[PDB]
Amino acid sequence: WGQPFRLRHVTTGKYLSLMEDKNLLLMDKEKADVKSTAFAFRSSKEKLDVGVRKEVDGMGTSEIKYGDSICYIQHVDTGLWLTYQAVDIQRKAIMHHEGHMDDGLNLSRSQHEESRTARVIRSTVFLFNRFIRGLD
Amino acid sequence: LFLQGYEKSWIETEEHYFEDKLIEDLAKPGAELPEEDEAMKRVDPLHQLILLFSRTALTEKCKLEEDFLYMAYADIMAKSCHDEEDDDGEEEVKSFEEKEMEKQKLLYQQARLHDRGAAEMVLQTISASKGETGPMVAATLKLGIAILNGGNSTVQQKMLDYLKEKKDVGFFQSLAGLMQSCSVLDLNAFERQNKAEGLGMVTEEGSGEKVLQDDEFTCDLFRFLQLLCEGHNSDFQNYLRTQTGNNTTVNIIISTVDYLLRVQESISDFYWYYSGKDIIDEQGQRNFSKAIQVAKQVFNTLTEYIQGPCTGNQQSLAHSRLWDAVVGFLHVFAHMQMKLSQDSSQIELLKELMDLQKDMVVMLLSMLEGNVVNGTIGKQMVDMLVESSNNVEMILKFFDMFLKLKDLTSSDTFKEYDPDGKGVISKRDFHKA
Amino acid sequence: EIQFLRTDDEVVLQCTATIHKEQQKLCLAAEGFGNRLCFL
Numbered sequence: 001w002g003q004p005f006r007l008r009h010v011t012t013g014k015y016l017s018l019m020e021d022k023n024l025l026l027m028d029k030e031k032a033d034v035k036s037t038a039f040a041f042r043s044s045k046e047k048l049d050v051g052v053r054k055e056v057d058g059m060g061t062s063e064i065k066y067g068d069s070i071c072y073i074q075h076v077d078t079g080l081w082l083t084y085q086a087v088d089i090q091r092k093a094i095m096h097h098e099g100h101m102d103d104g105l106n107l108s109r110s111q112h113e114e115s116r117t118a119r120v121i122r123s124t125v126f127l128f129n130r131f132i133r134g135l136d
Numbered sequence: 137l138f139l140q141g142y143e144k145s146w147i148e149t150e151e152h153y154f155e156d157k158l159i160e161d162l163a164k165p166g167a168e169l170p171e172e173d174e175a176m177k178r179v180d181p182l183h184q185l186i187l188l189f190s191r192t193a194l195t196e197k198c199k200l201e202e203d204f205l206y207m208a209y210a211d212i213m214a215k216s217c218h219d220e221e222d223d224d225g226e227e228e229v230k231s232f233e234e235k236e237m238e239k240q241k242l243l244y245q246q247a248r249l250h251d252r253g254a255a256e257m258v259l260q261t262i263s264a265s266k267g268e269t270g271p272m273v274a275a276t277l278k279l280g281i282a283i284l285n286g287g288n289s290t291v292q293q294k295m296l297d298y299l300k301e302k303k304d305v306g307f308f309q310s311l312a313g314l315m316q317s318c319s320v321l322d323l324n325a326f327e328r329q330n331k332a333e334g335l336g337m338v339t340e341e342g343s344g345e346k347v348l349q350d351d352e353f354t355c356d357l358f359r360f361l362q363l364l365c366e367g368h369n370s371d372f373q374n375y376l377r378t379q380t381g382n383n384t385t386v387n388i389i390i391s392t393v394d395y396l397l398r399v400q401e402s403i404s405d406f407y408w409y410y411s412g413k414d415i416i417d418e419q420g421q422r423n424f425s426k427a428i429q430v431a432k433q434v435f436n437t438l439t440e441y442i443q444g445p446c447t448g449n450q451q452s453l454a455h456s457r458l459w460d461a462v463v464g465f466l467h468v469f470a471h472m473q474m475k476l477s478q479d480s481s482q483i484e485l486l487k488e489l490m491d492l493q494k495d496m497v498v499m500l501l502s503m504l505e506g507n508v509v510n511g512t513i514g515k516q517m518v519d520m521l522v523e524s525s526n527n528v529e530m531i532l533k534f535f536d537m538f539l540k541l542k543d544l545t546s547s548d549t550f551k552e553y554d555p556d557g558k559g560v561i562s563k564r565d566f567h568k569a
Numbered sequence: 570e571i572q573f574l575r576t577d578d579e580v581v582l583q584c585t586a587t588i589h590k591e592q593q594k595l596c597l598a599a600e601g602f603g604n605r606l607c608f609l
Contacts, residue, residue: 057572067384111383111384112383113305113383123601123602124602127600127602127603128602131603
């Protein structure tokens with residue numbers, strides 16, 4: 001519950017990064033840093049936790065369950081919650097300080113039957129489209 | 137058209153079993169000698185038919201078609217395993233030399249049916265029907281209850297083994313879709329149906345009440361779910377809840393509770409339309425009987441889900457809307473039978489409702505089976521009773537007046553004042569006594 | 570306390586080598602579609 005990580009866009013091969021002017025920009029892999037790409041899950045919509053734990057040998061916990069559990073992701077270094085914005089269905093998310101409560105994020109993984117889906121997306125579209133673009 | 141309506145009924149009451157008892161016997165000869173170096177050795181045409189149906193079900197279509205052949209042969213197969221009359225009829229037959237023969241004959245017929253993959257076909261068809269009700273699924277469910285009738289552990293094990301080895305999720309998703317798409321009484325449509333052509337239905341376009349679109353379908357579906365777990369089969373009682381092998385788990389117990397709440401709301405809303413009225417309509421009593429039977433079947437399924445002590449099922453029920461459902465059911469039960477008491481013509485509906493009362497209290501008793509002393513289950517039971525205290529008080533306080541919804545104390549009047557007769561005492565004498 | 574290695578387990582091959590008088594930790598990477606060759 002709370003671990004810094006990066007985000008990988010499988011179909012484009014670029015990193016989801018927080019740009020300086022309070023918005024998210026999908027940015028390449030060659031240049032990156034943890035400060036722009038450091039996100040962690042939270043138990044709830046509050047600052048009740050700041051820093052705890054560290055590095056542990058094994059899995060052990062079976063903490064988060066897909067589907068049933070509810071999670072709130074949040075950037076750690078900025079300390080800012082992801083908020084949906086109702087601009088002018090295309091809700092372009094902007095980094096608002098407090099944030100609305102109607103921003104719950106459920107979790108549904110690519111299952112074992114969809115492990116083939118994960119394999120096909122990553123391998124096929126990433127490698128094939130990059131090689132084809134290079135040849136073109 | 138008159139001869140159509142005449143011959144549709146005057147010969148089907150005799151031809152159906154005569155055809156169905158013989159067609160399966162001739163389609164299962166299993167006698168001709170192959171005299172060839174082969175292992176399987178030409179089992180029967182019936183297995184070929186089962187494999188054809190299974191292949192059609194397994195073929196990916198995104199929409200299951202009509203397939204009149206399947207409905208015809210599924211009706212034939214379901215009626216093949218229905219040699220029992222399932223009625224007392226005349227006086228009671230011999231005790232332990234005829235019931236055993238009937239059970240063994242039924243078991244032999246179910247062996248003939250399920251030795252070829254009938255359970256496989258039923259599960260595949262239910263999974264293929266992507267949560268859509270209709271005659272596509274009605275015949276499949278009827279055949280399922282036909283092959284499962286009697287608590288057949290062999291076919292139960294076959295279904296469980298196939299589901300576990302296939303890791304099927306479409307079957308459970310389709311079951312959830314069907315139980316979501318089940319119907320209710322629709323009092324709003326009942327109003328329009330009642331108010332037609334001035335009064336009642338004078339034009340008489342047909343015999344479609346449309347008050348309950350699918351009644352036999354719902355009853356057969358829940359009978360299928362009940363027979364799936366009859367015999368205190370903990371394997372099925374757990375697999376209907378967790379589905380450990382699969383990834384996208386679907387809970388059937390919670391959905392059954394949701395359907396019970398949905399039908400309870402209809403039961404409650406069908407009360408106030410007749411509470412003000414002094415008499416109950418001929419269509420209203422039939423609708424009440426149908427809804428009562430549906431509620432009885434749902435309650436029986438809930439009893440079978442927990443009759444063998446299954447702590448997971450008990451906790452899942454304890455954390456559901458079953459408490460609101462039972463509170464509303466207690467209110468309706470409490471206010472219905474006393475209105476029904478005065479009328480002498482409507483005693484059959486009163487008895488049918490008291491059967492539902494018995495099944496409800498049986499379910500509430502089976503809720504407390506592995507009851508630890510200081511249990512959240514008992515705490516939630518008394519937390520249910522505290523707000524239903526009004527209904528509970530007015531049934532229990534009015535439970536003991538020598539008659540009138542309960543007692544055998546009324547005999548104390550007839551015995552005192554009668555010289556020799558069977559008892560023909562006047563109402564004034566009864567009141568004075 | 571102590572842990573061993575068993576089969577049907579996920580492992581990563583890492584090697585340590587130095588360049589420009591600076592140590593560089595490397596992990597073995599293989600692409601299954603683009604090229605059969607193994608890079609770092």
